[model samples]
Target: WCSTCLDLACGASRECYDPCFKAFGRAHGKCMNNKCRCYT
Candidate 1:
């Protein structure tokens, strides 16, 4: 599993998890002061 920091870009914080999980098959995310921390 890879872990990385992801910015929200033009997306809402609640709207960013699926794409990461779909692409990675094993993703976990949390919003931290508006940015996202993604773990797979």
Candidate 2:
């Protein structure tokens, strides 16, 4: 989804990416835009 978001040029944020990753546990989440892509 990060690729899709990045492709959309939304300046990808972990805030949005986390839920997307969590939504699909089949794939492990990783940092694609910035930070740990997960936070406190």
lDDT of each: 0.57, 0.38
Q: What is the lDDT of residue 39 in candidate 2?
A: 28
User: Which TM-score value belongs to model 1?
Assistant: 0.45
CA-RMSD of model 1: 4.2
lDDT of 1 by residue, 1-40 (tens): 3256665632454466665566555556766656666665
- Runs of candidate 1 with Cα error greater than 4 angstroms are 1-3, 9-14, 22-25
Please provide, for model 2 over 2-40, each residue's C-alpha lDDT reduced to its tens digit, 9 standing for 90 to 100: 332322222344544655456443223344445223322
The best candidate by TM-score is: 1
Candidate 2 weakest ten by summed lDDT: 2-11
- Evaluated at residue 36, the lDDT of candidate 1 is 62
